[PDB]
């Protein structure tokens, strides 16, 4: 996997070139906002189940036709793996986001993913809508605008962090 | 694997519809042509290495060329190989007769059998005659019609019986 | 799906064997308990919508905390939601009774349950109220015969061990 | 099934009037939803009081349920001058998933059953 | 608001419910001296309409112009037709409702 610094130096590697000093200051401001950063993932992870388990279920109340029989959050089986992939995507988004770089979840999460859902028959509109979700909460969390929890943080402006991680909730949703 | 009552509630299950009257009335009739069923089985289980060879016999006697080179019976390896995907065939059969549903029979038998017997050069006619032939022969074991084994029962019909190793052997014949 | 049949002939069929005389018998021990089974199993569908009610009306009764905000029963949409997952788990039960095998109930009520309870805050303990309930008041011969009752009770007790 | 049985009631402003509908069900979890139809035909959501919940409350706008009397009449306080519309009581489940016929739908495609309406002029 | 067309025509009910996660819509008539009566439903996801019973296909059809946009056709319009039209979803406190265009049918 990559992080933004290793994406970089990828990007630096395909032409043969030391790492240009605009790259550096790019990853240098990485590092100043790598406080926020680390102040984004927190209030990502320390909301994790609270984030999956509220899109699932909103998934469901807009849809109600995913847990009636045949749909794919019938059969508490069904409604077990739809919790764990929602907890899986907002894992690898997380990861993305701590990394600074989307390739992880795309190679770890997304990769092979479309196919596998298709295969399973997961609809891809329920499962977009729940990643949405997902990335309304996740940047609520990230902007401290969640109405019913609120996270201690110093002032400052983290559109970046949830620009970013709506970004990888974004490729979630495209991957699928 | 599914059997019959795992059938009826399978159906039951994707109308969210507890088990009616009609689907309980057809499992109490499976039940009461049990012990009818059990003899089927037992005909056919006590007469598989004869209905087998009998088969793959008959299907080689029709079609001289699988025993002659590049033929697919030719090659004692290729004909024990030929005997024991007979007998797997009929074993699913008979899982499929004691399980009053086919079920069994396509997901751990005939799911990809088509394909790798593409891919093997098996050929899909030769087979199709074998497990006609084992059709024929388990069809008379279970009428007890056999001219050369009668199995003692009690008198009655398994013509039932009969027509479900026939659909069995069937669905068999078409999957590949 | 778990079953006298299916368990028999899943193990026949990792040891590569026809069925057997111990085979036969199994679904000879189906053939001679389907009489019990389906009786439960028909009671069961006849008369669920009133056993779903009583059995959810007792778990509300029980945990009245339920109804606080914040908790599962904290609205009408979710308290129908927890009458519809007892009516989930007792036709998930009348299925076990028709099958003969735990099957459908491990497959598609107990499997994954405890990650989905979890996840939404359900307690286990208003489940396991609803179904002790239901065991408890059934009566015999009123409600059904006592093999018929062995096995409703039987499922109901499976339930429960799923669920504590 | 909805029965407004009254049409056509006058209170005047700064005042309390009850709506009285009735309604027939085999439904053992229900909504009770209270619309009033505008000038514009504008049918404008009001308030919603369900089977199993305590008598619904919208500061202005108030229920007083029944169970067994099936009487979720609507009461409205403290009129202003325009309140004046058609109201209906509306009778759906849209958020019941048992109680109800053995279909295979989800509820998205239950009606909401309307009765005749009451029309509400506010005099000063 | 309104839409005035002949006897034996087609009348086009657009509406403006701008519902994006909309699964099911349904169109509701009020003939304006009884209740606002559904005549149908339109199946979003799988484009299917559902007339209730005692009805005669043909008569309803449900027109899909945009991406989220919803239109009910009236084959053959009689006078009895005449009324007004809404387009209504669920919503999760209520059941949203169009701004509802009147439909006249005139000889």
């Known amino acids: 996997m990559l992080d933004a610094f290793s994406r970089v130096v990828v990007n630096s590697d395909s032409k043969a070139a030391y790492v240009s000093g605009s790259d550096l200051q790019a990853l240098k401001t990485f590092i100043a906002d790598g406080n926020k950063r680390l102040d984004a993932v927190n209030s990502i992870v320390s909301n994790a189940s609270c984030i999956v388990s509220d899109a699932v279920s909103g998934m469901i109340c807009e849809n109600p036709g995913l847990i009636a029989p045949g749909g794919n959050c019938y059969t508490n089986r069904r409604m077990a793996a739809c919790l764990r992939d929602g907890e899986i995507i907002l894992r690898y988004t997380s990861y993305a986001l701590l990394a600074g770089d989307s390739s992880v979840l795309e190679d770890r999460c997304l990769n092979g993913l479309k196919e596998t859902y298709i295969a399973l028959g997961v609809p891809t509109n329920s499962t977009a809508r729940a990643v949405s979700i997902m990335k309304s909460s996740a940047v609520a969390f990230i902007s401290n605008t969640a109405p019913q929890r609120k996270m201690a943080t110093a002032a400052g402006d983290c559109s970046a962090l949830s620009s970013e991680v709506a970004s990888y909730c974004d490729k979630v949703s495209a991957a699928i | 694997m599914l059997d019959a009552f795992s059938r009826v509630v399978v159906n039951s299950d994707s109308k969210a519809a507890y088990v009616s009257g009609s689907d309980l009335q057809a499992l109490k009739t499976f039940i009461a042509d049990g012990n009818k069923r059990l003899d089927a089985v037992n005909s056919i289980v006590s007469n598989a290495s004869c209905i087998v060879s009998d088969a793959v016999s008959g299907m080689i006697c029709e079609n001289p060329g699988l025993i002659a080179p590049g033929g697919n019976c030719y090659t004692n390896r290729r004909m024990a190989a030929c005997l024991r995907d007979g007998e797997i065939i009929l074993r699913y059969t008979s899982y499929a007769l004691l399980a009053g549903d086919s079920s069994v029979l396509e997901d751990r038998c005939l799911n990809g059998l088509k394909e790798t017997y593409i891919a093997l050069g098996v050929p899909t006619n030769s087979t199709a005659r074998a497990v006609s032939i084992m059709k024929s022969s388990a069809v008379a074991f279970i009428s007890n019609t056999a001219p050369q084994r009668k199995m003692a029962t009690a008198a009655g019909d398994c013509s039932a019986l009969s027509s479900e190793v026939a659909s069995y052997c069937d669905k068999v014949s078409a999957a590949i | 799906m778990k079953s006298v049949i299916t368990t028999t002939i899943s193990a026949a069929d990792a040891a590569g064997r026809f069925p057997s005389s111990s085979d036969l018998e199994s679904v000879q021990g189906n053939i001679q308990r389907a009489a019990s089974r389906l009786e439960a199993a028909e009671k069961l569908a006849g008369n669920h919508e009133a056993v779903v009610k009583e059995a959810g009306d007792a778990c509300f009764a029980k945990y009245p905390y339920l109804k606080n905000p914040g908790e599962a029963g904290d609205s009408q949409e979710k308290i129908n939601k927890c009458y519809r997952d007892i009516d989930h788990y007792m036709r998930l039960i009348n299925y076990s009774l028709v099958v003969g095998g735990t099957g459908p109930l491990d497959e598609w009520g107990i499997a994954g349950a405890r990650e989905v309870y979890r996840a939404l805050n359900l307690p286990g303990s208003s489940y396991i109220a609803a179904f002790v309930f239901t065991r408890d008041r059934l009566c015999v011969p009123r409600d059904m015969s006592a093999q018929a009752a062995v096995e409703f009770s039987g499922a109901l007790d499976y339930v429960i061990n799923s669920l504590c | 099934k909805v029965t407004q049985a009254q049409s056509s009631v006058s209170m005047p402003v700064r005042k309390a009037v009850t709506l009285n509908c009735l309604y027939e069900?085999?439904?053992?979890?229900?909504?009770i939803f209270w619309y009033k139809q505008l000038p514009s035909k504008e049918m404008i959501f009001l308030i919603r009081?369900?089977?199993?919940?305590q008598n619904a409350k919208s500061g202005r706008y108030s229920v007083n349920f029944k169970k067994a009397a099936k009487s979720v009449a609507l009461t409205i306080s403290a009129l202003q001058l325009e309140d004046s519309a058609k109201y209906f009581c509306?009778?759906?489940?849209?958020?019941?998933?048992?109680?109800?016929?053995?279909?295979?739908?989800?509820?998205?495609?239950?009606?909401?059953?309307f009765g005749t309406g009451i029309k509400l002029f506010v005099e000063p | 608001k309104s839409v005035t067309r002949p006897t034996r025509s087609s009348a086009e009910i657009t509406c403006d419910l701008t519902?994006?996660?909309?699964?099911?819509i349904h169109w509701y008539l009020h003939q304006e001296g009884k209740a606002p009566q559904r005549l149908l439903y339109?199946?979003?996801?799988?484009?299917?309409?559902?007339?209730e019973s005692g009805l005669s296909p043909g008569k309803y059809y449900t027109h899909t112009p945009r991406r989220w946009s919803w239109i009910l056709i009236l084959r053959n319009l009689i006078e009895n037709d005449s009324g007004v039209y809404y387009c209504?979803?669920?919503?999760?406190?209520?059941?949203?409702f169009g701004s509802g265009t009147t439909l006249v049918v005139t000889d």
């Open positions: 509306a009778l759906g489940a849209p958020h019941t998933y048992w109680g109800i016929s053995t279909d295979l739908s989800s509820w998205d495609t239950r009606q909401m059953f």
């Open positions: 339109y199946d979003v996801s799988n484009s299917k309409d559902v007339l």
């Open positions: 209504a979803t669920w919503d999760r406190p209520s059941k949203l």
């Open positions: 009081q369900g089977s199993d919940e």
């Open positions: 519902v994006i996660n909309a699964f099911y």
């Open positions: 069900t085999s439904w053992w979890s229900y909504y």
